[PDB]
């Protein structure tokens, strides 16, 4: 395995993952009241920019998509078209309780039972609306996921 080269590969993966986790750039999708709470996360109390996180509006240069709210049969195509227009490394955080699993209006027409059907959600979150602490902990869970992302090793073995 050239144990030295495997160590260099491990360090390269560490650097790459550290950069990608410390410069993460979300993309809001503020359908319903969770948007409010998400703003409270981006507010002064549980600051988000402190973790190197900037709500970039244009979906051509963002990394995550935060589906915060409640999908709708009228809104699904727009969400899918926005998701497609992102670069390769992507992640999806499903805020709220109806962006994941239908939630309340789950038992109602004109509502998509959870955004999992449209985009491949990565980490959801619980809440109604999730306490700003819960959303920030969700993003830190996303950091913990992207942190076990040995990638250069995969290319060196592929």
């Amino acid at each position: 395995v050239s144990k030295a080269a495997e160590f260099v590969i491990s360090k390269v993966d560490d650097l790459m993952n550290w950069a990608r986790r410390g410069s993460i750039w979300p993309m809001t999708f503020g359908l319903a009241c969770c948007a409010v709470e998400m703003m409270h996360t981006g507010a002064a109390r549980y600051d988000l920019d402190r973790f190197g996180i900037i709500f970039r509006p244009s979906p051509r240069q963002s990394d995550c998509m935060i589906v915060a709210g409640t999908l709708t049969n009228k809104m699904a195509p727009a969400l899918r078209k926005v998701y497609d227009q992102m670069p390769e490394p992507r992640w999806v955080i499903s805020m709220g309780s109806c962006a994941n699993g239908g939630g309340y209006y789950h038992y109602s027409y004109s509502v998509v039972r959870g955004c999992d059907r449209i985009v491949p959600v990565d980490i959801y979150v619980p809440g109604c609306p999730p306490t700003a602490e819960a959303l920030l902990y969700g993003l830190l869970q996303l950091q913990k996921k992207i942190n076990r992302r040995k990638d250069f090793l995969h290319w060196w073995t592929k």
Partner: protein
Amino acid sequence: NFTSNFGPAAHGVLRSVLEMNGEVVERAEPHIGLLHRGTEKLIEYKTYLQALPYFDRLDYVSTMAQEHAYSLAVERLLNCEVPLRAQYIRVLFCEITRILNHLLALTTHAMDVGASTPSLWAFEEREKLLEFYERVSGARMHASFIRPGGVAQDLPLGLCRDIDSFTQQFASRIDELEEMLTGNRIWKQRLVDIGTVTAQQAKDWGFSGVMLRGPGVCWDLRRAAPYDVYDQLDFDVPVGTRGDCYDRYCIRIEEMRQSMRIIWQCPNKIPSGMIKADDRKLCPPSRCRMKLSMESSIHHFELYTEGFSVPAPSTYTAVEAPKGEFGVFLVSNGSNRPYRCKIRAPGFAHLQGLDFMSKHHMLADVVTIIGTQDIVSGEVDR
């Protein structure tokens, strides 16, 4: 005439389409179905005590005035009086909710126009008030705390002292914010004379709340039809002289200050007593009685299985929400499920407003108009 689109801060989800001409909005038209849920259908296939959270979800900024309106509707239809301490704490929290909504709408307007520091300071204050919520009952937002006939749980000890501390520091904070925005020539030149509305077309397009009170006509439901303790709580009710963005803004700040006056008048008169009922047939019994007496258990069981039954008639009930005349139309008949509960959020009136009052302006002024209207697509569509 160009045909531009507008699908945007996070000021809700809305699809504006604009017949344009140079930099003039010859005709703006919103597409609004973009967040629909079937709240009325659900309420019907649901109940009273089970459908209260729906009203909590409508107009998700002002998260308690809605429950207050629904509770007033059920009580009116039911003839169930409510004790004085319940009324007083209910008004206290309705006014805290008004302050919440005003902070959010005002400073999000400031962000749309370009400022950011007012947004962050207002959001700190909103954090304080949401902490009050989640201490009294439930989560930060969406506290299902105002049931038919009073409140759910009594409030803790020390909450009044914290209320007073917040009252003082918050007078100071409003003063800071007003010094930061009111008078800045940029803000003045960006806001004034943008979206004039004569009272004739105001009453025609059926505005309510600050909007209707912006241009001239002085009419709010708290003074006209004083549903609750509001009499003993004298206040001011400001009124604007030339209906436009700047005057609606000043109205909003004066409404904040009057809400502070009310929020202080309550903890000086709050009559320590019982809460929420005197019949364990419309309000469930507390835990000690439920687990010690016998008929208390019967009534708790029946009341959490089938709820209370309200009689045949149908009613309309209006409340001065932070936005406007939040209306509820109940057509209940016999059985415990509300036949055809219809909502009358002011979002419809305010969007048709946008349509007519957004002519012969520029796109920055369209954004300004949305700001001053303080729309919540949640309640405009439900």
